[PDB]
Symmetry: C3
Subunit: 236 residues, 3 copies
């Protein structure tokens, strides 16, 4: 045989396999969820290396009575966590700090080398005592490998996620997602290199705000085909 | 031959040929024009690869009664074009969407490989049904080659432009402008590579707002030497 | 041996030498000081190439009666310095332009090649008559080499600084800080290249505002271990 079914099947496979192509994007969606259930999503994409870099001021829930707060006000609040008695706050800012972070990765990702680094409030490597002397990238713990959680990608065989609960303190984020080259070919070798470098960092980012998770599911996840997992382990 | 004239000629040539030098910038000016005639300009530069990346929230006319609107408010408006009934708008946002985009390129550009990609409202490859599975960079159509329009560069032999009319829907932009290496030398080959990589992405961007095109012509184009074309095909 | 002292010594050396490691960050802190003594600090870090890029609108003191000014308002003020009579200002904006810029560099820096380029108000190479034709990066004068000033790093042997007085005109900034490879090994050569490229531009930036220098010293410099020099040549 039936060629209407053969045509459906070819159509399916073309969609399912497309992300494996040269110059096809890997996709990263980071979702921050806050205590009253609001969500902020950050989308990054690239074919070669996704660099998902988020400042601590960017990860705060930044809406106050319908208006967006400035980086100045947000950083002022963050400062008191970084340096003792460096602002004038008499109470904490936990209302605006994420309770949970979800990382959704979809595409031809090198799962051995994808790294998620949760860094300090001013961008330093996280530790008890943050200091410029002991500041580095890609610590051993940031490589999640088989600690990624598999999720349905509806034929693509290519979505996983990672989840983390925060502890009431602002953080910043550095995610590095390299392309799978386990087919034995180094795309950085030879004259192709220039074409790869030209393609790095060329896709616009997008930040979205949602008052609750169901809005996120209805108008992001299911609009574009990223499967997401809720607190009841039900997929959307 | 007369050495006052010889000196003038050397002076002319030094200015005209300067952009061909190693570490000389290529120049990109993107101009958005809106329905009441206001203009927003975005300037990018690099010697090796210009990466002109603009979010859809950045391309909206964002001035409201003398004050700049927040990304939150702008994205809220954009959302309704991306996902059906995802905001509370009862009317469209066409007042703030560009009618026209102009791309001005000046310098030692590889015109075979310069690419202009008009992408969807959340940064995905543009198509009838946008979806994460079918998201890529540098589609075949983005390479304009002889569809660039030549304009005077006053001796430089090195300015072209590209124009597009939008259709009432928000878009995002990815422009990739590589350097002309048709003199036979690969600047990415050998020990020079590190010096090239150090130079990528090192020039500050600049965004400017104008209430009308003549302001743009008087205080940008003719101030710095980018020739621009108006709706009467007259140059400025 | 006395092994309590041997343990102290090993602990010291581990902290002092850490920045020499592969994937350890170089650190850059730029401090702008304004006429009433307020300070803005900008922090950048990377192990391979720090790219410290600051727009002129970002370098303005942008607080007005407790609220942060928009890029639109700030750029409007800057415009009049770039293009004659392009805004409606009847007085200058010198209250909000830095009097002084300090550049603090800490780590395994190639001091032969670190470059600090003070560029024009719209990002062009600085000169009497700024023009797109004569726009380039890494001019010979931007390499400071032995014009860097040595400062204590408390055992690291690895901090220097550079200072400049401005002249009442807005500027933009491009700082390029490459890693020291004088141990004879090219980290861009061979299969390591891909791992280097993956690490570029992956550390979150941080901007902070202080009403006076002592706040900067107490809650940034001495919090994280960057030594700073005041107008009395006393270190903090
Ligand atoms: N509700 C759930 N909670 C947690 N994990 C789930 C859930 N549903 C499915 N998964 C996991 O997702 C993975 C992929 O599932 P499945 O093969 O059914 O999806 P699919 O639509 O074929 O997608 P793919 O092409 O990605 O395989 C499996 O490991 C499965 O256990
Ligand atoms: N008013 C116009 N509308 C459209 N195209 C124009 C207009 N004026 C000039 N051009 C085109 O610009 C190109 C360059 O023109 P011309 O040689 O006169 O400029 P020039 O000052 O010598 O600059 P260059 O050094 O870039 O050649 C030509 O293809 C010309 O047709
Ligand atoms: N108050 C000051 N003003 C200007 N320069 C200073 C001042 N104090 C120290 N320096 C300079 O800093 C440099 C390093 O000093 P010193 O060796 O005492 O510091 P250290 O704590 O051992 O740090 P390092 O490990 O970086 O050497 C010297 O060149 C010194 O002259
Ligand atoms: Mg399956
Ligand atoms: Mg000509
Ligand atoms: Mg010493």
């Amino acid at each position: 045989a039936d060629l209407s079914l053969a045509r459906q099947r070819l159509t399916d496979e073309s969609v399912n396999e497309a992300p494996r192509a040269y110059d096809a994007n890997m996709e990263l969606v980071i979702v921050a969820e806050y205590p009253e259930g609001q969500c902020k999503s950050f989308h990054f994409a690239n074919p070669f290396v996704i660099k998902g870099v988020i400042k601590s001021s960017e990860l705060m829930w930044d809406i106050d009575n319908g208006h967006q707060m400035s980086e100045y006000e947000l950083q002022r609040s963050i400062n008191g966590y970084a340096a003792s008695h460096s602002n004038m706050r008499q109470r904490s800012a936990i209302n605006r700090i994420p309770k949970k972070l979800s990382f959704y990765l979809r595409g031809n990702v090198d799962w051995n080398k994808a790294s998620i680094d949760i860094r300090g409030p001013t961008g330093l490597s996280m530790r008890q005592t943050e200091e410029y002397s002991l500041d580095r990238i890609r610590p051993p713990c940031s490589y999640k490998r088989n600690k990624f959680v598999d999720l349905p990608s509806c034929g693509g065989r290519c979505e996983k996620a990672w989840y983390v609960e925060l502890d009431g303190r602002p953080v910043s984020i550095a995610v590095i997602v390299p392309r799978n080259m386990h087919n034995g070919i180094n795309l950085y070798a030879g004259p192709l290199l220039g074409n790869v470098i030209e393609g790095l960092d060329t896709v616009p980012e997008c930040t979205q705000w949602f008052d609750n998770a169901p809005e996120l599911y209805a108008y992001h996840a299911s609009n574009y085909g990223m499967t997401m997992l809720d607190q009841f382990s039900v997929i959307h």
